Amino acid sequence: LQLRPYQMEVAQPALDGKNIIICLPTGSGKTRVAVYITKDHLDKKKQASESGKVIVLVNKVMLAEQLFRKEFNPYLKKWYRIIGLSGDTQLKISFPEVVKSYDVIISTAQILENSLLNLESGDDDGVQLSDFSLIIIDECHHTNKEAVYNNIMRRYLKQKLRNNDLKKQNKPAIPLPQILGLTASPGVGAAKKQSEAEKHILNICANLDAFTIKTVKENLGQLKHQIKKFVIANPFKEKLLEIMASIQTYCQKSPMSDFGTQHYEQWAIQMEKKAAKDGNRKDRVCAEHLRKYNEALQINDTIRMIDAYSHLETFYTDEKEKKFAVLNDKLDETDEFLMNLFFDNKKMLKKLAENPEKLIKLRNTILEQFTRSSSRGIIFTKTRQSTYALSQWIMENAKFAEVGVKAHHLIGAGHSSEVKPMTQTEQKEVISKFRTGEINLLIATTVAEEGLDIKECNIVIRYGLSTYVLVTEREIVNDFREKMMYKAINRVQNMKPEEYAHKILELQVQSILEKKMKVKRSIAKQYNDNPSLITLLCKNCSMLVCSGENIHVIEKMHHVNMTPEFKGLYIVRENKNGEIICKCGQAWGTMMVHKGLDLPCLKIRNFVVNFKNNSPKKQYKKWVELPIRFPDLDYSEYCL
Amino acid sequence: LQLRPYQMEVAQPALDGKNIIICLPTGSGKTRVAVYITKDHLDKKKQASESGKVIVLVNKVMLAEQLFRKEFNPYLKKWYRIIGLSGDTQLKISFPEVVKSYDVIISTAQILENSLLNLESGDDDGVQLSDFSLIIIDECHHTNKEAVYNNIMRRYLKQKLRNNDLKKQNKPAIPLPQILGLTASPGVGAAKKQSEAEKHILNICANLDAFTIKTVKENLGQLKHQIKKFVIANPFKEKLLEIMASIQTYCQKSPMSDFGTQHYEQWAIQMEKKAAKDGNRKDRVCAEHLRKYNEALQINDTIRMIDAYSHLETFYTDEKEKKFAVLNDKLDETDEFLMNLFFDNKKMLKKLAENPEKLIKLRNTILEQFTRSSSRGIIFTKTRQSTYALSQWIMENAKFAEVGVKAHHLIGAGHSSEVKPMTQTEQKEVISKFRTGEINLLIATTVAEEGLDIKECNIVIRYGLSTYVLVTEREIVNDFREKMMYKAINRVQNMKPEEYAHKILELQVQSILEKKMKVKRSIAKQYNDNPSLITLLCKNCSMLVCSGENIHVIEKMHHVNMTPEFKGLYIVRENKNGEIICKCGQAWGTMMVHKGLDLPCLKIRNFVVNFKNNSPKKQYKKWVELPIRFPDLDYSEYCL
RNA sequence: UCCAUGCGCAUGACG
RNA sequence: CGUCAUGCGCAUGGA
RNA sequence: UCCAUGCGCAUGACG
RNA sequence: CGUCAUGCGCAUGGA
Ligand SMILES: Nc1ncnc2c1ncn2[C@@H]1O[C@H](COP(=O)(O)OP(=O)(O)O)[C@@H](O)[C@H]1O
Ligand SMILES: Nc1ncnc2c1ncn2[C@@H]1O[C@H](COP(=O)(O)OP(=O)(O)O)[C@@H](O)[C@H]1O
Ligand SMILES: [Zn+2]
Ligand SMILES: [Zn+2]
């Protein structure tokens, strides 16, 4: 494995066992350097005939699979054992065993941490930093806060300090391993000065326990050889603002602020809690609606108002279906006022929606772009709904197709925000096509920003965040931060080893003590662990829904209430297991059909608390907040 | 942008580049004139194709936001770049950059000055008056003393004199900009004659470097067209005076003056220092109590004595809680004497408080007022406690409500005087309501006097400071001063340019030299910078509390003492982070829970000094007084 | 290969 | 500390 | 949007 | 120079 020159020197310290960081710009292929380090380290331990383990960590799974596909296996296919361990890829054999085998490991963070947790737990599954003789890391910039990498290294620190004490006062000290670290750039956070930046860097180094930053300040020429702009372009709104003010009047709601910002939203949520802490109507009820309206506003500000019509079409049609289901098996004053207030305008509002708008301006921009140019394309933005809107709206346009441009959307995987997620599989499909050329232009939130191999693209437009385009000042501040961190890197590199040691020791101790304080407060957190002290109520209608003991649990995750005395209440709904809804139409939960039972599960977001102590109403958004505990279900009971 | 006639001529000189002042009465809308000047100036620099910058300054933030909302943007929305820069409104991009962009600037004083300070500092953030080709100012009357406006212009002067010297003895001289200035009225201070007034005016002109005052002495008719009275209305006191004299007897305290004035208070404070310089009891202890009593007196003189009962209820109940906490985890001779001296009367004193009083007289006045009259209302006064008292007392009255009058209070924002402050947000809420009509009558200290848009109000009552009412001679003197400044304006306008120049040059030099003397003395001020030379003692009990080196710092603002040897002392209290209190009940500070630590912060007001040199006790009210310096905290230590 | 659930984390904007 | 948006990782269960 | 802290400034009354 | 009251501005930190 021949090593490029600029890679040679930067690696050189690590071959002496110095636990250093190694930062190199993208495109330099810092992986093959890592292989050189690992292979050399293994050969050194081979010469010593001792336990040579490397446990490489990447935060994302795709990185791990890529490393197992392309870089580590092909180079070390011959000599050593490898395994592309990950959470998703089922591995019949547990981790302690692969620690006893498979000298080399690709892996992913919280798998290792889970195993270490099991060591600290009574699972009897064990692993220690002791067992490894080396660790290798990627994207060290993540190692700042309560991140997984940081949690992994924090345990190692405490052991180091114990070992330092043991050295002075004891013959034996526990072994600890080397720690490499690779990053595209160390990063700088919350810096408006060089000094805060340097402190950040030192924090990172302490977290990694490293001896020094390392860069290539010598062979910059070959690097520049191999490694190689900001362009910037109604009555419907008012029609809706008028209704919002009408509803404030209907509600006596004082915003204290304007329409079309997060501040209005936050006040709406706070009023929603208070009205939930009141069990009143037109107060929480109307906060919910106004949240929808404000979202309609701020998407409208950036999006075709047709999409706001779509948003509220979805919303209000679901409202009709909820009330219609409620009718099956009446309507309140509030709901009638609001719903009719909408429907009286809905049709004309759509007529307004037809009328010509960042989107139109942008089209004028990007169509002009697609004449210059193999065609490649990228887009960024913030929301997942914006991506779909851009995709559909662009599809509707005849000009974009006429140019031959084909476009597809792209978002993450997580199950939040009320959007249809994208699977890992389908992401791979899309990027493979963007390499095939089926789609010329991607639409992405931040997935494409990193990890995914998107490259060779002329245009990278950012809408509201190698030609560069930035539609909508933020580039300037980023440039300033880049300059600031380069200067700080140089400063730290040129520092006294003694002062450097003193500085990092102090930061290490600070981190450890802060964790200990965290643990003290955390242990103090949960104290009650009560079986039944409460009542769950519908939050629109401050109505009794459940008690505390009638509840039960499954999977030690989900909470459901049998005892069909409860079942006499709710209503069921579904369109396209099924969904539960209130006698007032308030959404309650899902009919989880599992374990041979149609368990009526619910979600604590939508309910409100009343302690037996008569303590004030509370809203949590998650069960785990309260420390009280509910029983696990006994199928012998309810067996029937 | 068409310009009104009386505005036309007054502006005319400035279009020639003369750096003049422009004073116009309120209601003339002098902003649109400023726009005309700026736009014309920009168009002139456009014709020259040179750097056209305007940096408008207002002392208050609200003025800036108003200018960005209403006047500059709408008129110049099209051509030029604008930015409503302020301290509160977070601006991701720093100031030097907005100096490199955003041709037009609204701003606020000390932001600019901070940037200029950074230029003089090593921050590397830079800006100069050079960069700007124009400055615009509002409320120039502020530019008298060490005000921000004055500090800003003082730097410019020195550079001007250097440039004057450079002109005679050098080809190149540094560029300097025009300086406009707008004010409602120039103002006159400490004048009992025309001559002192004229000197004041000249001082203002020199500070602004202006060429001339400008007024409209020609188009007064249209002005008067667009621009358009003094009415004036017990045993409880004695009950308390008797106790005060009883306590003098208990203390051998000789006032040398009477009860119910600042003089008694000031002597009380001086005795408090001396008794702190004695470490004695019944001397500082009783000065504190008598300060409370005298405040009770002078509020009582103007306020319902129920509120004095409230004041001392608060005080003595807190005394009980302090001593009760002290008991947890005894009582002195002094405290028992004083407390029982109070409690023996407290109930009957309240009974007296029920008995009918400026307030009652005033009610008889203002109720009569509210029959004449859309209803609008204003009130002025001095204290913040008076506003609350008026609001609650008026609320309790049935007549004021019966008339339909609704009333709300209003005060500033600052965190001083032991009152609940009012946020900017809530001030906007109130004035918006006073425009809506929810509240008919405001109660205000001086906030309403200016800046805030309060208008169209028939009544403006002043209680102890377009019908005018003045409840309680001061109007006469104000009228005299107004006449005196109008005459002086006319005099200065009609003056020789040569003599005018000579006069202002001399004043400019005087100001500069005075600043240089200030800087010399200031540099001479701090000289010691010692780590630990002292001991901090409780001031009631002359007891050791801290040393000098055991102290540490955070934020380079706050001082806390870890080393729980200290922690063995104090006691904690809270009612409704938390508060620290003495083993004798003397208040010490706050348990600042920050950075993952429950740091026990303290306040130097409440402690007393003892140098290692054995120098006499000292009280400072602020840490910064002493030049000695304490270390910044090292979290590595105390990490645990 | 898809679906549902729970948990933890970071980033950005805001208050 | 709270809100929103975004992305990520882990652990359950099912088709 | 709220909270706590530090700093500087001006005004008025007084001594 | 000191005291009180009032108002303002800036800079930190947190929820
Ligand atoms: N010793 C070497 N000599 C020549 N090229 C190398 C060497 N090591 C790595 N490379 C180049 O680096 C590239 C791999 O970069 P990669 O690791 O994908 O980038 P990143 O560091 O962003 O993951 C390869 O295309 C390869 O040509
Ligand atoms: N050229 C003009 N013609 C007519 N009216 C004008 C002109 N310029 C300003 N105004 C009036 O001045 C008013 C603005 O005054 P404003 O600037 O708020 O007062 P202040 O000077 O106290 O801030 C506006 O209501 C407007 O009618
Ligand atoms: Zn309900
Ligand atoms: Zn004490």
Residue numbers in the entry:
A (entry chain A), B (entry chain A): 307 to 534, 539 to 543, 549 to 644, 668 to 694, 699 to 715, 718 to 809, 828 to 834, 842 to 945, ...
Which statements did the authors publish about this structure?
Long cytosolic double-stranded RNA (dsRNA) is recognized by MDA5. MDA5 cooperatively assembles into helical filaments on uninterrupted RNA duplexes longer than a few hundred base pairs (bp). The helicase consists of two RecA-like domains, Hel1 and Hel2, and an insert domain, Hel2i, all of which form contacts with phosphate and ribose moieties of both RNA strands. The helicase and CTD, linked by a pair of α-helices referred to as the pincer domain, form a ring around the RNA.
To complete our structural picture of the MDA5 ATPase cycle, we determined cryoEM structures of ADP-bound WT MDA5-dsRNA filaments in the presence of magnesium (at a physiological concentration). We obtained two similarly populated structural classes, one with an intermediate helical twist (88˚) and the other with a high twist (92˚), with overall resolutions of 3.9 and 3.35 Å, respectively. In both structures, the density in the nucleotide-binding pocket unambiguously corresponds to ADP (or ADP:Mg2+). The filament structure and helical symmetry are similar to those of nucleotide-free filaments, with the helicase in the semi-closed state, and a 2018 Å2protein-RNA interface area (smaller than the ground and transition states). However, we noticed that density in the map was weak for residues 810–827, to the extent that it was uninterpretable in the (higher-resolution) high-twist structure. This indicates that residues 810–827 are more mobile or disordered in the ADP-bound state. In the ADP-bound state, WT MDA5-RNA filament segments had the same broad distribution of low, intermediate, and high twists as in the nucleotide-free state, with intermediate twists being the most abundant.
